[PDB]
Structure formats: structure tokens, C-alpha cells
């Protein structure tokens, strides 16, 4: 059904990893989209063809306005191509580099968008596991969209900043993992760096396992309450997504249609 000849390739949007993403237009429909181009070689060498086929199967059925659509896929002798939705405002990662942190309104909005997408996800027993600013895209109305579904499996790596303790220790993990990740995002959005950043993987491991973060002065009590509630070692004490969406700090600072 799909072949490279159906697309006009524009410029690069980002680089792999297993491969690069390019802006592209489908020739017939003039539909603008993004093409992830993974090389079969790396995929084979890192042994991820199995997880990719998983991710692709998971991603193609999901329909939510805060989740990035996969429209389709194809492959050539030397490449696998994924046909993704193009998010025209880029990564949250890069937006954060530009602003050196977000105000409460933007943060509370992003966390609402994210918790909604995660409610939808958990209600199909899909745990993301990789929520991080490099995987968060922004649509044309500046709305957050989760991308990069790889690294996620039906319930129950590089830098370890976004992982909860029960996952870096190799233990059992459920949906509560994504709640930890939100607390790490919420922190990084407000402060400009994640709460357990360190110069080495080995220090970050320690900081996560022992739950060692301090708030700078500009962080308000309502932000400190929700972050502290999300960053609990016992997955059981983390709140549900609904408690998060109804948190007084969120309700007071977020945005709603
Ligand atoms: N699907 C998708 N759309 C975008 N949009 C986008 C728009 C602008 C820029 S910028 N400011 O030029 O660097 C970058 C990306 N990225 N994208 C991806 O899959 C994607 C991703 F998830 C992470 C990194 C790179 C990507 F390419
Ligand atoms: O030659 C193939 O049949 C091959 C196909 C695919 C693939 C096909 C459809 C969807 C998706 Br998602 C991936 N992935 C590969 C990854 C590595 C290697 Cl060595 C080969 C493949």
C-alpha cells in the first residue's frame, strides 16, 4: 500500500538513534506528515525489530488528541519507514531550552494534557514508560502530544532521570510508573532541569532510589504539594490521574475547552 515514491521528502526534523525524521508530503493528497526512517541494520544489531513491531501495533490503534498518530508504515530492502503525524511546533525539549523553564500556567496545562493522554492510555492498559521532553511534541494550537511509544509494554535505555525506583531496581511496575514520570516532568518544567539530574548515571541512580530532590525558592506550595505526592517511593501512595487533574494547583493554573 505504501512506497517511498508516494512521498516528497522535505527537511530533517530530528536525527536517530535507529533513524531520522523528515518532513514529507504525500504526492497524491498533498497531506503534510513526518517520516521516521529507520535502517534495518541498526534495528537488527540492537535487536529491537520485535519491540518496534509492538510499538507500531500499539500506536496505530490509539486515538487521542494528545497522542501523536501513526498513519501507516512500509519497508524497503534497507529501511523501515513510519508515517507519522507532523507536529508543527516542535519538541517541548526545545521549547524548554529556549525559555529556560515554564511558568505555572503552561506547566499546569501541559500536565493536564499529559494526564488526560495517560488516562486514555491506562484505560487500554498501556503504560508509556518513556515520557520525557524529547518525546513530547507540540501541535499547531501549542497542544502537547505524546510521541515515541517505544519502550512501552502492556502492563505490568539511556539516561535514567524519568524512571521510578521500582523500575531502575528491576522490580514489578504497573501504571503508577507514569505518575512518577509526571512528577519528574512537572519538576523539570518549573525548574528547568529534572529533579535527580547528576553528572553520572551512577549518582542519578542513587538520587532516584533514595528520592533526593530539593525545590528552588521560586517553586510555590501548590507545585511542591503535587510534585511531592507524585514522587513517592511506594507506587501505592502515588495519586490516581483523576486526583492529579482535580489537584488545587492544577485546577487554579490550567486551561480547559
Ligand atoms: N512527528 C514529528 N513532528 C515533529 N515536528 C517537529 C517540528 C519542528 C522541529 S524543529 N523546531 O524544526 O526542530 C522538530 C520536530 N517532530 N516529529 C517527530 O516525530 C520527532 C520527534 F518526535 C522527536 C524529535 C524529532 C522529531 F522529528
Ligand atoms: O526485512 C524485513 O522483513 C523487516 C521488516 C521490518 C518491519 C516491517 C513492517 C513493519 C515494521 Br514496524 C518493521 N522490520 C525489520 C527490521 C529489521 C530487519 Cl533486519 C528486517 C526487517
Q: Is 17 annotated as a binding residue?
A: yes
Q: Hey, do 2-90 and 91-254 end up sharing a CATH topology, with the first three levels equal?
A: no
Residue with cell 534495528: 43
- Cell numbers given for 184: 519528574
Q: How was this structure determined?
A: X-ray
Measured in angstroms, how far is the CA atom of residue 14 from the centroid of ligand 1?
6
Whether residue 91 contacts residue 133, with contact meaning beta carbons closer than 8 Å, is answered with: yes
Whether residue 137 contacts residue 144, with contact meaning beta carbons closer than 8 Å, is answered with: yes
> In the annotation, is 130 catalytic?
yes
Alpha carbon distance 98, 249 (integer Å): 25
Q: Which atom of ligand 2 is nearest the CA belonging to 40?
A: 17
Measured in angstroms, how far is the CA atom of residue 56 from the centroid of ligand 2?
11
Q: Which atom of ligand 1 is nearest the CA belonging to 134?
A: 23
Whether residue 38 contacts residue 55, with contact meaning beta carbons closer than 8 Å, is answered with: no
* Domain 2-90: top CATH class: alpha beta
91-254, superfamily in CATH? Transferase(Phosphotransferase) domain 1 (1.10.510.10)
* Catalytic member of 6, 130, 217, 225: 130
Residue of 38, 41, 36, 42 lying closest to 21 (CA atoms)? 36
Domain boundary assignment for the chain:
2-90, 91-254
- DSSP letters, the chain, are ---GGGEEEEEEEE--SSEEEEEEEETTT--EEEEEEEEHHHHHHTT-HHHHHHHHHHHHH---TTBPPEEEEEE-SSEEEEEE---TT-BHHHHHHHHTS--HHHHHHHHHHHHHHHHHHHTTTB------GGGEEE-TTS-EEE---TT--B------TT--HHHHS-----THHHHHHHHHHHHHHHHSS-TT--SSHHHHHHHHHHT-----TT--HHHHHHHHHHS-SSTTTSPPHHHHHT-HHHHHH----
Q: What is the resolution of this structure in A?
A: 2.5
Amino acid at each position: 500500500q505504501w512506497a517511498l515514491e508516494d512521498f516528497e521528502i522535505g527537511r530533517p526534523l530530528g536525527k536517530g538513534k535507529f533513524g531520522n525524521v523528515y518532513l514529507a508530503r504525500e504526492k497524491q493528497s498533498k497531506f503534510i506528515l513526518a517520516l521516521k526512517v529507520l535502517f534495518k541494520a541498526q534495528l537488527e544489531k540492537a535487536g529491537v525489530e520485535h519491540q518496534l513491531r509492538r510499538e507500531v501495533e500499539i500506536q496505530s490503534h490509539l486515538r487521542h488528541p494528545n497522542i501523536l498518530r501513526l498513519y501507516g508504515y512500509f519497508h524497503d530492502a534497507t529501511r523501515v519507514y513510519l508515517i507519522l503525524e507532523y507536529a508543527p511546533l516542535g519538541t517541548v525539549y526545545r521549547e524548554l531550552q529556549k525559555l529556560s523553564k515554564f511558568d505555572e500556567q503552561r506547566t499546569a496545562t501541559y500536565i493536564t494534557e499529559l494526564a488526560n493522554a495517560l488516562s486514555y492510555c491506562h484505560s487500554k492498559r498501556v503504560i508509556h514508560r518513556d515520557i520525557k521532553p524529547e518525546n513530547l511534541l507540540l501541535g499547531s494550537a501549542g497542544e502537547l502530544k505524546i510521541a515515541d511509544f517505544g519502550w512501552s509494554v502492556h502492563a505490568p535505555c539511556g539516561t535514567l532521570d524519568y524512571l521510578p525506583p521500582e523500575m531502575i531496581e528491576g522490580r514489578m511496575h504497573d501504571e503508577k510508573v507514569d505518575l512518577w514520570s509526571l512528577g519528574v516532568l512537572c519538576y523539570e518544567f518549573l525548574v528547568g532541569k529534572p529533579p535527580f539530574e547528576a553528572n553520572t548515571y551512577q549518582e542519578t541512580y542513587k538520587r532516584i532510589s533514595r528520592v533526593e530532590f530539593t525545590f528552588p525558592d521560586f517553586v510555590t506550595e501548590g507545585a511542591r504539594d503535587l510534585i511531592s505526592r507524585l514522587l513517592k517511593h511506594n507506587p501505592s501512595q502515588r495519586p490516581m490521574l483523576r486526583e492529579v487533574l482535580e489537584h488545587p494547583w492544577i485546577t487554579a493554573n490550567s486551561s480547559k475547552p
